[PDB]
Amino acid sequence: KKYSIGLDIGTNSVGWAVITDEYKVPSKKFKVLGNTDRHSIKKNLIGALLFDSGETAERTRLKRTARRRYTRRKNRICYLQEIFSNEMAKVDDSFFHRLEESFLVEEDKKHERHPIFGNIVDEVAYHEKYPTIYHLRKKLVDSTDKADLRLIYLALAHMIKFRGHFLIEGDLNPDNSDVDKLFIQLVQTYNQLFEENPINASGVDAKAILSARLSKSRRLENLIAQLPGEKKNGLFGNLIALSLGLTPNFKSNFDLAEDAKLQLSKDTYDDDLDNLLAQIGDQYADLFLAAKNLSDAILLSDILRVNTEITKAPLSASMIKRYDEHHQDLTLLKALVRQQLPEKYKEIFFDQSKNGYAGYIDGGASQEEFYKFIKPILEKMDGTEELLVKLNREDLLRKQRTFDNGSIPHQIHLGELHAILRRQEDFYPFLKDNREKIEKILTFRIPYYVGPLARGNSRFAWMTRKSEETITPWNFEEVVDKGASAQSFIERMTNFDKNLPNEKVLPKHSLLYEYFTVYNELTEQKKAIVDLLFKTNRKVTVKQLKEDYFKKRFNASLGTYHDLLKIIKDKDFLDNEENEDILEDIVLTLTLFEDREMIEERLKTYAHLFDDKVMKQLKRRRYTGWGRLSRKLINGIRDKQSGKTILDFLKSDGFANRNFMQLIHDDSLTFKEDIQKAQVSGQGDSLHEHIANLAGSPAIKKGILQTVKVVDELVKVMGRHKPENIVIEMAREGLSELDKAGFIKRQLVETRQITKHVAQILDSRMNTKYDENDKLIREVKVITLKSKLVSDFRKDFQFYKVREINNYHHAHDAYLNAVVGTALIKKYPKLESEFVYYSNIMNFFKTEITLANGEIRKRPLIETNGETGEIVWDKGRDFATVRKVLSMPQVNIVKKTEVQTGGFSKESIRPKRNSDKLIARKKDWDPKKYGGFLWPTVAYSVLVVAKVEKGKSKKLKSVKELLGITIMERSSFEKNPIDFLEAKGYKEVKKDLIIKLPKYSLFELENGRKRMLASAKQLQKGNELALPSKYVNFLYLASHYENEQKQLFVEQHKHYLDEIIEQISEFSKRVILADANLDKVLSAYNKHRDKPIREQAENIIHLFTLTRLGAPRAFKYFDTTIDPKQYRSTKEVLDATLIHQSITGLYETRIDLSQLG
DNA sequence: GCTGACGTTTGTACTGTAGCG
RNA sequence: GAUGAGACGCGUUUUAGAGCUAGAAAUAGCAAGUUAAAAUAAGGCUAGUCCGUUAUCAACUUGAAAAAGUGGCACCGAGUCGGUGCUU
DNA sequence: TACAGTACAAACGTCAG
């Protein structure tokens, strides 16, 4: 007999349901394997697979980047120490070894305690002479003294490590460092985006309003009070506030519906800024870059404020003069305190937990916590005004290692490098011989297009070698094949157009992209409009359109047409038609790279077009990002009837215009057929490659894979017979004949490309037969549904969903996918070109139709299709079946058992203490002496039966125990489990009996109670409530008590509130075992029953957190908060029935673990 | 979010200890 | 909304930065403090200025692995699946 | 020889990241 499937593919679950011709689900009796006494189990063929959500590579990428950064940093040091190696070995033989084991305690350390000089006199006197490394650094710069080589090393290393940033290109000049010149460039950028309401920098001295001895807020308001055209709430004002490192609300400016807060000091500023630009435009990107550059410049004028000489180590000198300022302010504060406020001293300067100077130096407090502790203490205190104003301009008792040190360029460290090096060349000859080598060590940066410097063994790299020898800062220029590496960067980094695959996506400031998007929005008058307006200003207002042309604002812009007209300065060149592709490749070099030499090497191909000054400016220009479209989509394909391209149709289209999405979607044109012919993957792909070829989140792709697997298993069930229909939903998180048809399309048809891709995967998986001709035979037809059809079925037919009760709702939604899609496909035979891979198509389920006049019109109760004579939907019989299935108490819910993968532990390194639970950070490093990590991630648990040592008599006591293999020791456990377990103290373990138990491994124990494994030390809730349809339909309708017969349905059935509460009571006594929670709940229901039914229901809807599957989690009922009963034990599952579940969950293998021992 | 860290806060083995002249 | 490449700044951890004074003291008073080295997943071998947190994974039989293979039907009912009748 | 003194091992909240 024929059957169908429906699937509810969410980000966290895949509902699956099997339905016969009649919409009823089967219920096969499945075979059970293993040592239990149930040889079979009856299961309904409906279910949902639950799984933890597929996460992005982003955090792995961030970690990987950190790992490379640290490795290259201590190669930078190793290169330094190699250069110093022989000559240090003379000047102080053990010095680099003393610096190597500096982290060690004295018993572990082979050499002396004090790392620099060995002895306590010279090292203490180093620190007295130099309390901060910047004292040594400015000494070595200022002072031609023949200083001890150890000190040379320490300053050079404190610059080669911690070398600042590489954002300023070439040398340091006032055109890219002075706050004045840059504020001038920022106002030019503001006036470039907004030619309306500009401002003039001539009234504002950014060297003295900015960088003044006042706060961010004083300087902001002094700046506003000298701008004629602006005000502190406005756009330019918030840009300066942000530059000032304050946190403005640009949503007040762009009139955004959600809030939009920005702070340049914040570590997620890039994400927030990117959301801001998705929301406001792309034109703003050079405005915000100029404001970021201004923040870095005023940060540089604030940090570099000592100016006693131009060569005079200006960073080190300021860190010193700050130490001077800090030690006088600290002498002042301590004296102030102990003479005029004699108590409270200890909480400030000794406590070490509180946010005073104790916690600020000695403990864990940051400068902002310290300012929020100290401000309430300088307030209500006298004589302290000089300190309070230092705190107000955030200068009070600053550290030298702060969050602001990321403003420091590498040219500052190179000038101090060069000063130190060629201040001591004439005393150390190897400092002259290798000064170019050390200056390369700090200056060298691997370019963005070369990647990791692999030797074939990297997944990530593409670097191409001109020589087979070891890469270095010095030999990089010749051992890397830069050209081949950059061509490999070109070919790896180009993404591909999802509309037309295997075609490179354009740079998003491509000029063919610009002409296209302006024309697309603007849909010979077009030609006149763009030549007169869009080629003459960056953003055409509709007032200008009417005044300049209708007499005789638009989002889209030719901004790069304007940039190039500004930069290369001859207009007749950019309007010239054969000059498109030179310029397409210029914008492509210029968006692809961020390196000076690679841009210059590629622009050298064009050195004959433009003069070396504008070429210099063109290489100084830089663009970022990428569009969603390829030139073969915009201007390559062409219609076979009319004989023009998409772009030509955008330019001329007759009397009636079409948008780009219509040039794709239009039936009449041949673009859609060419696109759908091209949509397949080149030369094909595997299942896994195809899902990694889809356009979506990894969680959705995980759902798509679990969908494919539950389908392949729902045909491994019921004898390899394929389903006649598969219905898919990707979950949501008058009229003329062509308009009646458009309202059918509006109802029935998926707009989201991911689901069509799912239908393609399932189709190509299921359908594998062919004619004598090339014609496909498709044994399965794959249906894509839409949630509104389902949700209308749910809402209209009193058939409601409220997802707090149980995870059955995923399975019920897939059953709803199955019945709605399978009724639709036999109701409408001729419409299978319209959803397989009268106008309100949903009305065939209805009993009665309410018309626009108010009147009522009836339908047949049995609903049938006239094109076949087939019965399709028997109201009151299929409608009754679906209510049975939604009520039905057994639904297979499988939490996918998963090996936990991820970080070895939580990231924070905890201090040293006598606890055994600490995870050693190295193998040499005893946690009792060094500290270490905590909260290791259990990768999987393992059931071990063994002897272990017991008592002072050292008995070999036999134990069955659940041991947590952590992610760290998974590799060693899987290398040899016997010797790992023997090293864990488990003796003569039974190898054939060892049972691997990943997270969410399921056990059944008593009275049907199921409990599942979070870890060898923690368990989670298994079962869930079968509340029959009446109770769930009630509790939706009651929680939505606030059509009126639906309110009366809730004032009737009052007792269902009591019945639901006693069913959850019964159940959680049976399964949840949180007695004091049920007692609180039953007595609180007695306490609060006088609250309205609507309030009752909405609180009981939250109360199912008492029963929901998985982790115990806190919840509330009116005034009362109920805390989780955490199952931090595992002793019982050792004698439970372990269940190994199939990915659908139908097939089972059950191990009664009590039989093991 | 939710596994586990880290205390308190109870519940189990081992040695003492018992009015006496 | 996927993914990748180059740098930074901190943060943490241990160590070094002589503490002093008393006095039986489980440390009180005072003084000090700003910095640095090192490590930043353990580590791995093809030994690279690389790789190590994404994806993937119920169980059983073959297979180094890749991978393939493993569970009768229908009915009547439903507390998470229970029961009856044919069949091998 | 039953209970007392008391050194020792599971369980039960709030943090912690």
Residue numbers in the entry: 3 to 525, 543 to 571, 586 to 766, 907 to 1010, 1039 to 1243, 1252 to 1366
Provide the publication's sentences verbatim.
CRISPR-Cas9 is a powerful tool for genome editing, but the strict requirement for an NGG protospacer-adjacent motif (PAM) sequence immediately next to the DNA target limits the number of editable genes. Recently developed Cas9 variants have been engineered with relaxed PAM requirements, including SpG-Cas9 (SpG) and the nearly PAM-less SpRY-Cas9 (SpRY). Here, we combine structural and biochemical approaches to determine how SpRY interrogates DNA and recognizes target sites. Here, we show that SpRY binds diverse PAM sequences by forming non-specific interactions with the phosphodiester backbone of the target DNA.
We revisited our largest cryo-EM dataset of SpRY in complex with NAC PAM DNA to search for any minor species that may represent non-productive complexes. Surprisingly, when we re-performed 2D classification using a larger particle box size, we observed a subset of particles that were much larger than anticipated. 3D reconstruction of these particles revealed the presence of a dimeric SpRY complex, with two SpRY gRNPs bound to the same DNA substrate facing opposite directions—we refer to this structure as a “SpRYmer”. Within the SpRYmer structure, the first SpRY is in the product state, with both TS and NTS cleaved. The second SpRY is bound to the same DNA molecule through its PI domain but has not initiated DNA unwinding likely due to the lack of substrate complementarity. Dimeric Cas9 has been observed during target search when two PAM sites are proximally located. SpRYmer assembly is stabilized by direct DNA linkage, and by a kissing loop interaction formed between the nexus stem loop of each gRNP which was not observed in the Cas9 dimer. This unanticipated structure further supports the propensity of SpRY to stably bind to DNA irrespective of sequence.
